[PDB]
Enzyme design. Structure first.
Site, PDB file in Angstrom:
ATOM      1  N   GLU A  63       0.844  -1.184   0.000  1.00  0.00           N
ATOM      2  CA  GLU A  63       0.000   0.000   0.000  1.00  0.00           C
ATOM      3  C   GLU A  63       0.880   1.236   0.000  1.00  0.00           C
ATOM      4  O   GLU A  63       1.713   1.386   0.906  1.00  0.00           O
ATOM      5  CB  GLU A  63      -0.918   0.022   1.217  1.00  0.00           C
ATOM      6  CG  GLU A  63      -1.851  -1.168   1.368  1.00  0.00           C
ATOM      7  CD  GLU A  63      -1.506  -2.023   2.575  1.00  0.00           C
ATOM      8  OE1 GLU A  63      -0.365  -1.915   3.066  1.00  0.00           O
ATOM      9  OE2 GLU A  63      -2.374  -2.791   3.043  1.00  0.00           O
ATOM     10  N   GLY A 136      -2.828 -10.397   4.278  1.00  0.00           N
ATOM     11  CA  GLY A 136      -2.296 -11.041   3.086  1.00  0.00           C
ATOM     12  C   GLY A 136      -0.874 -10.636   2.763  1.00  0.00           C
ATOM     13  O   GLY A 136      -0.004 -11.488   2.568  1.00  0.00           O
ATOM     14  N   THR A 137      -0.619  -9.329   2.682  1.00  0.00           N
ATOM     15  CA  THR A 137       0.732  -8.864   2.391  1.00  0.00           C
ATOM     16  C   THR A 137       1.717  -9.482   3.366  1.00  0.00           C
ATOM     17  O   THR A 137       2.556 -10.305   2.987  1.00  0.00           O
ATOM     18  CB  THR A 137       0.807  -7.338   2.459  1.00  0.00           C
ATOM     19  OG1 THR A 137       0.104  -6.771   1.350  1.00  0.00           O
ATOM     20  CG2 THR A 137       2.253  -6.878   2.416  1.00  0.00           C
ATOM     21  N   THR A 171      -9.218  -7.809  13.975  1.00  0.00           N
ATOM     22  CA  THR A 171      -9.708  -6.872  12.980  1.00  0.00           C
ATOM     23  C   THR A 171      -9.916  -7.526  11.626  1.00  0.00           C
ATOM     24  O   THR A 171      -9.804  -6.850  10.597  1.00  0.00           O
ATOM     25  CB  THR A 171      -8.740  -5.698  12.853  1.00  0.00           C
ATOM     26  OG1 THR A 171      -7.480  -6.172  12.364  1.00  0.00           O
ATOM     27  CG2 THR A 171      -8.533  -5.042  14.209  1.00  0.00           C
ATOM     28  N   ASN A 198      -1.643  -8.751  20.300  1.00  0.00           N
ATOM     29  CA  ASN A 198      -2.198  -7.443  20.605  1.00  0.00           C
ATOM     30  C   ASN A 198      -3.041  -7.469  21.867  1.00  0.00           C
ATOM     31  O   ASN A 198      -2.996  -6.516  22.643  1.00  0.00           O
ATOM     32  CB  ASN A 198      -3.015  -6.928  19.425  1.00  0.00           C
ATOM     33  CG  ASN A 198      -2.158  -6.619  18.226  1.00  0.00           C
ATOM     34  OD1 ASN A 198      -1.510  -5.577  18.168  1.00  0.00           O
ATOM     35  ND2 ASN A 198      -2.149  -7.522  17.257  1.00  0.00           N
ATOM     36  N   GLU A 246      24.410 -17.620  19.645  1.00  0.00           N
ATOM     37  CA  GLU A 246      24.279 -18.076  21.027  1.00  0.00           C
ATOM     38  C   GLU A 246      22.829 -18.023  21.476  1.00  0.00           C
ATOM     39  O   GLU A 246      22.373 -18.874  22.246  1.00  0.00           O
ATOM     40  CB  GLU A 246      25.142 -17.224  21.961  1.00  0.00           C
ATOM     41  CG  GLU A 246      26.634 -17.264  21.690  1.00  0.00           C
ATOM     42  CD  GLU A 246      27.419 -16.322  22.582  1.00  0.00           C
ATOM     43  OE1 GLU A 246      27.938 -15.313  22.062  1.00  0.00           O
ATOM     44  OE2 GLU A 246      27.524 -16.590  23.797  1.00  0.00           O
TER      45      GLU A 246
HETATM   46  N1  LIG Z   1       1.204  -4.236  17.394  1.00  0.00           N
HETATM   47  C1  LIG Z   1       0.602  -3.681  16.199  1.00  0.00           C
HETATM   48  N2  LIG Z   1      -0.284  -4.524  15.359  1.00  0.00           N
HETATM   49  C2  LIG Z   1      -0.904  -3.957  14.131  1.00  0.00           C
HETATM   50  C3  LIG Z   1      -0.657  -2.646  13.768  1.00  0.00           C
HETATM   51  N3  LIG Z   1      -1.324  -2.392  12.644  1.00  0.00           N
HETATM   52  C4  LIG Z   1      -1.990  -3.524  12.290  1.00  0.00           C
HETATM   53  N4  LIG Z   1      -1.717  -4.484  13.222  1.00  0.00           N
HETATM   54  C5  LIG Z   1      -2.288  -5.823  13.127  1.00  0.00           C
HETATM   55  O1  LIG Z   1      -1.776  -6.550  11.783  1.00  0.00           O
HETATM   56  C6  LIG Z   1      -2.770  -7.251  11.300  1.00  0.00           C
HETATM   57  C7  LIG Z   1      -3.023  -6.835   9.812  1.00  0.00           C
HETATM   58  O2  LIG Z   1      -1.802  -6.770   9.188  1.00  0.00           O
HETATM   59  P1  LIG Z   1      -1.639  -5.762   7.907  1.00  0.00           P
HETATM   60  O3  LIG Z   1      -0.177  -5.467   7.684  1.00  0.00           O
HETATM   61  O4  LIG Z   1      -2.416  -4.469   8.140  1.00  0.00           O
HETATM   62  O5  LIG Z   1      -2.229  -6.521   6.560  1.00  0.00           O
HETATM   63  P2  LIG Z   1      -1.229  -6.828   5.285  1.00  0.00           P
HETATM   64  O6  LIG Z   1      -0.170  -7.820   5.694  1.00  0.00           O
HETATM   65  O7  LIG Z   1      -0.581  -5.529   4.836  1.00  0.00           O
HETATM   66  O8  LIG Z   1      -2.134  -7.424   4.043  1.00  0.00           O
HETATM   67  P3  LIG Z   1      -3.056  -6.389   3.148  1.00  0.00           P
HETATM   68  O9  LIG Z   1      -3.930  -5.583   4.085  1.00  0.00           O
HETATM   69  O10 LIG Z   1      -3.906  -7.187   2.191  1.00  0.00           O
HETATM   70  O11 LIG Z   1      -2.145  -5.458   2.378  1.00  0.00           O
HETATM   71  C8  LIG Z   1      -3.988  -6.929  12.150  1.00  0.00           C
HETATM   72  O12 LIG Z   1      -4.283  -7.990  12.953  1.00  0.00           O
HETATM   73  C9  LIG Z   1      -3.563  -5.721  13.016  1.00  0.00           C
HETATM   74  O13 LIG Z   1      -4.189  -5.819  14.361  1.00  0.00           O
HETATM   75  C10 LIG Z   1       0.263  -1.764  14.637  1.00  0.00           C
HETATM   76  O14 LIG Z   1       0.470  -0.636  14.320  1.00  0.00           O
HETATM   77  N5  LIG Z   1       0.869  -2.308  15.831  1.00  0.00           N
HETATM   78  N1  LIG Z   2      35.304 -15.238  36.547  1.00  0.00           N
HETATM   79  C1  LIG Z   2      34.514 -14.848  35.342  1.00  0.00           C
HETATM   80  N2  LIG Z   2      33.753 -15.858  34.636  1.00  0.00           N
HETATM   81  C2  LIG Z   2      32.951 -15.501  33.426  1.00  0.00           C
HETATM   82  C3  LIG Z   2      32.937 -14.227  32.991  1.00  0.00           C
HETATM   83  N3  LIG Z   2      32.158 -14.170  31.913  1.00  0.00           N
HETATM   84  C4  LIG Z   2      31.676 -15.407  31.659  1.00  0.00           C
HETATM   85  N4  LIG Z   2      32.185 -16.202  32.604  1.00  0.00           N
HETATM   86  C5  LIG Z   2      31.692 -17.588  32.392  1.00  0.00           C
HETATM   87  O1  LIG Z   2      31.915 -17.979  31.139  1.00  0.00           O
HETATM   88  C6  LIG Z   2      30.695 -18.979  30.755  1.00  0.00           C
HETATM   89  C7  LIG Z   2      30.214 -18.700  29.340  1.00  0.00           C
HETATM   90  O2  LIG Z   2      31.236 -18.998  28.452  1.00  0.00           O
HETATM   91  P1  LIG Z   2      31.653 -17.863  27.308  1.00  0.00           P
HETATM   92  O3  LIG Z   2      33.056 -17.331  27.601  1.00  0.00           O
HETATM   93  O4  LIG Z   2      30.642 -16.697  27.326  1.00  0.00           O
HETATM   94  O5  LIG Z   2      31.623 -18.586  25.807  1.00  0.00           O
HETATM   95  P2  LIG Z   2      32.928 -18.622  24.791  1.00  0.00           P
HETATM   96  O6  LIG Z   2      33.068 -17.287  24.122  1.00  0.00           O
HETATM   97  O7  LIG Z   2      32.723 -19.678  23.763  1.00  0.00           O
HETATM   98  O8  LIG Z   2      34.161 -18.925  25.585  1.00  0.00           O
HETATM   99  C8  LIG Z   2      29.741 -18.784  31.612  1.00  0.00           C
HETATM  100  O9  LIG Z   2      29.612 -19.963  32.480  1.00  0.00           O
HETATM  101  C9  LIG Z   2      30.189 -17.552  32.477  1.00  0.00           C
HETATM  102  O10 LIG Z   2      29.808 -17.712  33.756  1.00  0.00           O
HETATM  103  C10 LIG Z   2      33.731 -13.157  33.720  1.00  0.00           C
HETATM  104  O11 LIG Z   2      33.697 -12.053  33.319  1.00  0.00           O
HETATM  105  N5  LIG Z   2      34.513 -13.492  34.896  1.00  0.00           N
HETATM  106 MG   LIG Z   3      -2.357  -4.793   4.906  1.00  0.00          MG
END
Ligand SMILES: Nc1nc2c(ncn2[C@@H]2O[C@H](COP(=O)(O)OP(=O)(O)OP(=O)(O)O)[C@@H](O)[C@H]2O)c(=O)[nH]1
Ligand SMILES: Nc1nc2c(ncn2[C@@H]2O[C@H](COP(=O)(O)OP(=O)(O)O)[C@@H](O)[C@H]2O)c(=O)[nH]1
Ligand SMILES: [Mg+2]
Ligand SMILES: CC(=O)O[C@H]1C(=O)[C@@]2(C)[C@H]([C@H](OC(=O)c3ccccc3)[C@]3(O)C[C@H](OC(=O)[C@H](O)[C@@H](NC(=O)c4ccccc4)c4ccccc4)C(C)=C1C3(C)C)[C@]1(OC(C)=O)CO[C@@H]1C[C@@H]2O
Ligand SMILES: Nc1nc2c(ncn2[C@@H]2O[C@H](COP(=O)(O)OP(=O)(O)OP(=O)(O)O)[C@@H](O)[C@H]2O)c(=O)[nH]1
Ligand SMILES: Nc1nc2c(ncn2[C@@H]2O[C@H](COP(=O)(O)OP(=O)(O)O)[C@@H](O)[C@H]2O)c(=O)[nH]1
Ligand SMILES: [Mg+2]
Lengths: 431, 428, 48, 437, 436
Positions: A63, A136-137, A171, A198, A246
């Site tokens: 749209e 749809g979109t 809606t 929502n 991760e």
């Molecule tokens: N959290 C949130 N939900 C929204 C919002 N606007 C629409 N929705 C929800 O999205 C759904 C409709 O999706 P749309 O994107 O409007 O429809 P579309 O995918 O563009 O398909 P067409 O209307 O045919 O072009 C409805 O259930 C709305 O409640 C918004 O601003 N915030």
């Molecule tokens: N003493 C100490 N231990 C840590 C710290 N950060 C992570 N650890 C441990 O490291 C573990 C996660 O491994 P990580 O290093 O994040 O993954 P890697 O990047 O593959 O080595 C977890 O069990 C953490 O508790 C730190 O800053 N100080």
């Molecule tokens: Mg739409």
């Protein structure tokens, strides 16, 4: 070196991308006119010859009525206009229109733009896909884009934050069809999916922020807060850095089970902040509280399989450890037997940022909990029962069959969803 | 003479090494500018065990920092003591590790060895008399565990006569920082049983205990725990760096410690540790050092030596003291509580001493214990492995790198045999 | 090798099939065809 | 005494020649005005090797600049060190060479040689004891190849005794700056084998990597590559200019390098080479200089020593050092990698040293190697030449200047003769028996 | 010292003459008065204007071009436009009657009585030169003045100079779009005449430039005044090495030897990049790598020929702006690795690169945007023989009925000269086959 690509499809995609980017520019000091008055913006931006920081996002839609609001708004000097992609006609809430008829004309330019956007990247971390299942979109075009992205990159990691069709507040009337179709299409291609609803966020805004009339922008503010918390460790220092690979490895146990809930804490009003203390134990208890879940799922109808936590601000690892041990000792939290482990924790020294004219309150501690529980069987059962109730009569099926589909696509999707709920049942069953 | 080359792998290793080189450098009175500004001529004599001369009187460390996703190196490269390192000793890959032992060992690690080995050799030959290697690990993640071991097997064959230490930080029993932790642990242990000479085990949890049960701290940070690990690591090479009336080289510390080639897992503890209020009451004498170190709380690992028996032990005292008290004290212990010491080893302690205490103290010690309670780490890890490997959970991530399945069981059987060796020699 | 002043063959990349198990107790230049008979095809002009 | 007259050919040699004279002039501490403002008397001891004393105590280089299309001489005239050249040493032609060897060697060449020789002689008598000549080339264009070799032949018959160097830049293996490149390359080699006494070959490619990996540079410009070439060009004559405990003239570097009159194509490399970052930490010792130099990357020529065997080599250190260390170092390499060194030569490295290091360093070394892997260059060139001459592409130009066809086949045969010389001595043992078995 | 003579014939010849000379006067700061402002001198070098101008006895700079045409109605425009103080009135040439889209009139009847006038103008315009690189002929193949007189001119140039180099930037008849009906005839009639006389001929099409204007610049209302601006950009980038400094200078002579392998294969394509507006321009970096990719794209060609159906016999890349030789050396090597871009076996080489430090200039009120990097590619591909085959078809389609022939034979021709010119094409076409 720590760079990601963001894709906002459908209407809600760009509706939340606007919030995310108003957050990021403010967080990194980027004025709306591109430039500011290293290695901190390079995760989301690219510097031109002089000062200009253009974001590495893409806004895709069918749209013009929303991409033109964006083009005319204050955030018009930011984007390379070739990133803002729009179409002449829309999908009209029709999976067939979004997948077979309309999206296949602009996939070519979307993909070559993604190519040009990933060229300048040195170390690419992954693809964030903000989608809204139910329109749809969103649905069909995201399925098509994800299939093309999987055949192109494959080794890269795709996170998909999918606003999911809601239980009651809805809606639309046809969305139980395109939700099943989008799931059956993207399941094999997305690397992880974060569900959010929502209704759940409406309830959160009601009970915590004391706001009673949220106009789709408070929900977007909350989603922006969530992504900022989730991707902090990419662009901010702090103990226990955590990146995308991760994040997905120790969270997705089987190739099928990759849908997961989300939460956030604290989430309060500018006066309850000033009249509360918000220690890390309270924060983690509120995060694991069911009434804080951003999706309409009750975790007490299941058993957790893993959780990921990203603490921000004034947090210490001993406190994180003690609070996780307290949660374990608690009796209302269950865990499927084959995971004696179950928590991937990370810390960041950067507290969550607040926006001018916002609604949250300045805090110094915050938690974004993301868990993979076996209770989303209930939402899959809801969606399947609704698809069933409707497709028992062949309601609305002539639209989907005229717009370039046939019948077998409904049966494939329904059998895939039945198998998925049987998976969610079995892989949790214990000997 | 007696040079030492030092490795720091993984995020954990790249952060323990930060405080380590901050501790040692201050011990020799050199600035973050690398220039020497100490007072005594004692610092200059054995400075070359860790550093190399440079133009203008700078002293760069003999370190090697290797890591996937160099984001954490950007921190230390920006810290206060980040300007001392040579920039060519910064090996990194553009991609990420993913807490996955496989790609940290098979796919991505292999693409870095070709560069890492050129780094280790070019500064293993600058040593006129190489003594040994030392590394800092983390058995949880992928970079520290995966690339760590893969680096060792290359080193074990290139330099088989030299000695290789591993200050590996092992997983915690009650709270796991990762979920895939048991898989990454054993697959690394299966490398350390065969490709390691000494392996000190540490636990972040027991470090927390000492941190607020003895130190009575309030907001412990990883920057403070590393001020503990760096204190015991610095406590080993004192005999290499400082004179003493009973010195103890690094090699002679092993022969007196491991009776059999497989039992190379130890447990360490530092002494003295007091609060800011306790230094007013407690006195600093050898009988104090010898009870706080022999207690079952300073054991930096989460293993209670009272559930087993000591095979051998050690102690590296620092400071001008009476070398009789040290001799009769470590004797008195083995006689009093004779239930915790084996019988077919009459005198199962070694005692060294250095005339040079820490920079700020007057007496200090350091402890190394080879107990049969170390099997407790291996029982707890064995079950957490089998509880999810029998279900084939989180496993499709490992076969994604072409890994086999027997590489899991062989890695496990190797453990469940090591857990029995620690029990034969424990006649209770 | 900058450290030994010698041309040595590169080490072996690991392979998952060749993993370690329980038990572990343990460059001439390419010559040039100086005297190699070149290929003599029958594409002379006399034959044609 | 030991004077050296310098020539600068083509656009390339005229451009690196602007950089070389910027290095030596600053090495002897003279300013872009040409007046000496150095410190030691050593700068004045052997200044006559390159410069002529002028009125008012100024030193003008003994250089010659030859090039058609005088626009480029308007550039060096405008550079910072442009005002030091005698403007009567600026022989140019209004026409253009056209990257055409023929007219650069037959038509437009013959129109300047009567003028250039009148210049070269003019400053050959200004020397009391001429050591030798030296030219800068670029085997690609017409001027560097055509006029260059046409000039050498004129010099060889009028000064047979003296020696001629050649810092010829050769084509690149993978990229071509011109399209008629393999035509101009071969037609020149048939002239360098007879009329040159030494010829260092250098390539733009291997310079880009040295500037990329070693120097860690991001955007090397020609102002940087030519800064490298100018370095080693100065690294050769350090014995002529400065004292040394083991001196090495130009002639005594040739007799110890070319065992046979046809194998006078060398391969150079400079040391040390580091970035601004690592320079803070690297200690400069003879070991560090002797590992870097013997590496296969530092060879500024695109010829891999692993594909061959070193006939001889050389090493021109400079700086106050220990003359034993350099002597046993080169002995180790000959013993570790004995397979890459011929055995019908007992020792095949000559080690020289000068007491004066470069202006800003403390130690520095320059490497010359006469390897049998150079034949790779002549294979590749002789391959492209026979890929287009077989079809006679781009040939109607060369016949336009009165050339013919035989003068092409001779040019290629005179290469396949040369590339056999390398293959024979690369696989000939001390015994006459092992080869034929 | 390094001077060229620029000749514009016909209408489109002097239409782009209004575009090139708009650029050069703007690029060197010359205001339309022919004077320099003399108070805000921007010219980094002196005697650089000498490539295109001739400083008079005091202050004024007259361009060394010659506007030639038979229709008064367009050269009478130049004499009234703002660019009337520049040209010496003796340079602008006009006739009373027009060739009227007839090669016979442009070549035989009318052309023969004003060449003497034009030739004497060239003679006096080359005497004041010291070093003349070569002429620069602008033509529009398809008209009577452009082809008829343009061909008759080159013969008179060859018999006089011969050793001098001539270039032709001849606009070529488009396959689909065509603003005439008899252009298949007088086009063929032109080539057979220019071929033995021109030394190299760059070709470009009115249709292919429309699409470049449609896709990249995204203009919905293109006009000849929008295309003519592009040709100014090419020749500015081409002759930059004549009137500017920079590594890897390229002269016309050096440009001609290593780009034309056989005496008759000289019909070469063209391309330019980047071509963007002011909006996209500044959310970008325009790496040397991405520019030289668009240069070798089939869409960025200015002729409606598909290079992917043939192979490249050579390529010439004039870079412009801030470019370092390593990126050209590293990005060209990227292309040789591609598989879509073929090269005939007999050229393992194929690139004659060029760099200039003087970035491209932009016309105020133009359509292009200011940049710091630009690439004008000039390739000699064998696929160009296809566009030479369409005209072999259309000429054969109408010459069967002998339509419109009574005009040509009515104006001092013979039917022989029709099959004459036809020989040279079918002969030329197979020449593009022999090299395959
Ligand atoms: N959290 C949130 N939900 C929204 C919002 N606007 C629409 N929705 C929800 O999205 C759904 C409709 O999706 P749309 O994107 O409007 O429809 P579309 O995918 O563009 O398909 P067409 O209307 O045919 O072009 C409805 O259930 C709305 O409640 C918004 O601003 N915030
Ligand atoms: N003493 C100490 N231990 C840590 C710290 N950060 C992570 N650890 C441990 O490291 C573990 C996660 O491994 P990580 O290093 O994040 O993954 P890697 O990047 O593959 O080595 C977890 O069990 C953490 O508790 C730190 O800053 N100080
Ligand atoms: Mg739409
Ligand atoms: C503070 C300091 O010592 O800085 C050094 C420096 O760090 C390094 C990196 C220098 C530096 O060189 C470069 O960075 C460089 C860049 C592009 C191309 C070539 C070099 C240096 O520029 C080069 C310069 O060398 C000289 O001054 C020599 O005398 C050299 N001079 C010139 O080439 C020269 C430069 C400008 C004008 C005229 C001459 C020389 C070389 C051969 C023969 C005679 C003189 C020096 C030591 C330095 C800097 C300034 C950083 C290095 O270069 C040389 C020639 O020694 C590059 O690797 C070496 C190692 C040096 O340590
Ligand atoms: N690119 C471009 N092409 C033009 C322009 N003007 C005319 N053309 C084309 O040139 C061809 C007509 O050539 P002309 O110059 O008008 O004819 P001529 O050579 O003057 O001969 P006469 O018509 O008898 O006067 C047509 O194909 C036009 O499309 C222009 O301004 N720019
Ligand atoms: N290292 C370096 N090489 C150059 C330079 N300029 C030109 N070259 C090479 O010179 C070759 C062109 O020959 P050239 O001298 O310009 O043509 P000539 O006038 O007929 O001799 C090309 O292969 C260029 O790569 C320069 O400034 N530095
Ligand atoms: Mg006309």
């Amino acid at each position: 070196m720590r760079e990601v690509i963001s894709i906002h499809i459908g209407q809600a995609g760009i509706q939340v991308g606007n919030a995310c980017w108003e957050l990021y520019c403010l967080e990194h000091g980027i004025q709306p006119d591109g430039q500011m008055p290293d290695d901190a913006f390079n995760t989301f931006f690219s510097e031109t010859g002089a000062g200009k920081h253009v974001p590495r996002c893409i806004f895709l839609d069918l749209e013009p009525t929303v991409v033109d609001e964006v083009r005319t708004g204050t955030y018009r000097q930011l984007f390379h206009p070739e990133q803002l992609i729009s179409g002449k006609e829309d999908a009209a809430n029709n999976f067939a229109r979004g997948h077979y008829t309309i999206g296949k004309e602009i996939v070519d330019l979307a993909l070559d733009r993604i190519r040009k956007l990933a060229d300048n990247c040195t170390g690419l971390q992954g693809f964030l896909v903000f989608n809204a299942v139910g329109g749809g979109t969103g649905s069909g075009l995201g399925s098509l884009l994800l299939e093309r992205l999987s055949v192109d990159y494959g080794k890269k990691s795709k996170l998909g934050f999918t606003v999911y069709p809601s239980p009651q507040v809805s809606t639309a009337v046809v969305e139980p069809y395109n939700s099943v179709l989008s799931t059956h299409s993207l399941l094999e291609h997305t690397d992880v999916a974060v569900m959010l609803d929502n209704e759940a966020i409406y309830d959160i805004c009601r009970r915590s922020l004391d706001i009673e009339r949220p106009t789709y922008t408070n929900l977007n503010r909350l989603i922006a807060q969530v992504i900022s918390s989730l991707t902090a460790s990419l662009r901010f220092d702090g103990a226990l850095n955590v990146d995308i690979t991760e994040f997905q490895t120790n969270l997705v146990p089987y190739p099928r089970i990759h849908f997961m809930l989300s939460s956030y804490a604290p989430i309060i009003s500018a006066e309850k902040a000033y009249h509360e203390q918000l220690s890390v134990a309270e924060i983690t208890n509120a995060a694991f509280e069911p009434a804080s879940m951003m999706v309409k799922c009750d975790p007490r109808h299941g058993k957790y399989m893993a959780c990921c936590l990203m603490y921000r601000g004034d947090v210490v690892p001993k406190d994180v450890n003690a609070s996780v041990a307290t949660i374990k000792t608690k009796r209302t939290i269950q865990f499927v037997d084959w995971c004696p482990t179950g928590f991937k924790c990370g810390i960041n020294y950067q507290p969550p940022t607040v926006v001018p004219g916002g609604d949250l309150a300045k805090v110094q501690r915050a938690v974004c909990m993301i868990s993979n529980s076996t209770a989303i069987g209930e939402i899959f059962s809801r969606l399947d029962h609704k698809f069933d109730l409707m497709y028992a009569k062949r309601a609305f099926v002539h639209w989907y069959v005229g717009e370039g589909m046939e019948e077998g696509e409904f049966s494939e999707a329904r059998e895939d969803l039945a198998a998925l709920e049987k998976d969610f049942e079995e892989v949790g069953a214990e000997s | 003479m007696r040079e030492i080359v030092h490795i720091q792998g993984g995020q954990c290793g790249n952060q323990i090494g930060a405080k380590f080189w901050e501790v040692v450098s201050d011990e020799h009175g050199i600035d973050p500018t690398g220039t020497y500004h100490g007072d005594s001529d004692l610092q200059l004599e054995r400075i070359n065990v860790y550093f190399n001369e440079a133009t203008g009187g700078r002293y760069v460390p003999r370190a090697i920092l290797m890591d996937l996703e160099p984001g954490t190196m950007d921190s230390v490269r920006s810290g206060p003591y980040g300007q001392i390192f040579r920039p060519d000793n910064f090996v990194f890959g553009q991609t990420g590790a993913g807490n996955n032992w496989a790609k940290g060992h098979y796919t991505e690690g292999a693409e870095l060895i070709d560069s890492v080995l050129d780094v280790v050799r070019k500064e293993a030959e600058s040593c006129d008399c190489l003594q040994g290697f030392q590394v800092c690990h983390s058995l949880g993640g992928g970079t520290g565990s995966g690339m760590g071991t893969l680096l060792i097997s290359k080193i074990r064959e290139e330099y088989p006569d030299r000695m290789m230490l591993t200050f590996s930080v092992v997983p915690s029993p009650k709270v796991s920082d990762t979920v895939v932790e048991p898989y990454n642990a054993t697959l690394s242990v299966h490398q350390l049983v065969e490709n390691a000479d000494e392996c000190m085990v540490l636990d972040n949890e027991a470090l927390y205990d000492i941190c607020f049960r003895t130190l009575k701290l309030t907001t412990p940070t990883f920057g403070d725990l590393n001020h503990l690990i760096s204190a015991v690591m610095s406590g080993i090479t004192c005999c290499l760096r400082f004179p003493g009336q009973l010195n103890a080289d690094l090699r002679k510390l092993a022969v007196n410690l491991i009776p059999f080639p497989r039992l190379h897992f130890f447990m360490v503890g530092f002494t003295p540790l007091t609060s800011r209020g306790s230094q007013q009451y407690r006195a600093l004498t050898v009988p104090e050092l010898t009870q706080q170190m022999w207690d079952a709380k300073n054991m930096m690992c989460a293993a209670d030596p009272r559930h087993g028996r000591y095979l051998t032990a050690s102690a590296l005292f620092r400071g001008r003291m009476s070398t009789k008290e040290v001799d009769e004290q470590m004797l008195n212990v083995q006689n009093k509580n004779s239930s915790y010491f084996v019988e077919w080893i009459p005198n199962n302690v070694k005692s060294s001493v250095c005339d040079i205490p820490p920079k700020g103290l007057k007496m200090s010690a350091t402890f190394i214990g080879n107990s049969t309670a170390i099997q407790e780490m291996f029982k707890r890890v064995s079950e957490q492995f089998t509880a999810m490997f029998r279900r084939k959970a989180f496993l499709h991530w490992y076969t994604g790198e072409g890994m086999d399945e027997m590489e899991f069981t062989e890695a496990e059987s190797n453990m469940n045999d090591l857990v029995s060796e620690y029990q034969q020699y424990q006649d209770a | 090798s900058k450290s030994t002043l010698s041309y040595k063959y590169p080490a072996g990349r690991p392979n998952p099939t060749g993993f370690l198990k329980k038990g572990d107790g343990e460059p001439s230049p390419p010559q040039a065809g100086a005297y190699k008979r070149r290929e003599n095809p029958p594409n002379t002009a006399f034959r044609r």
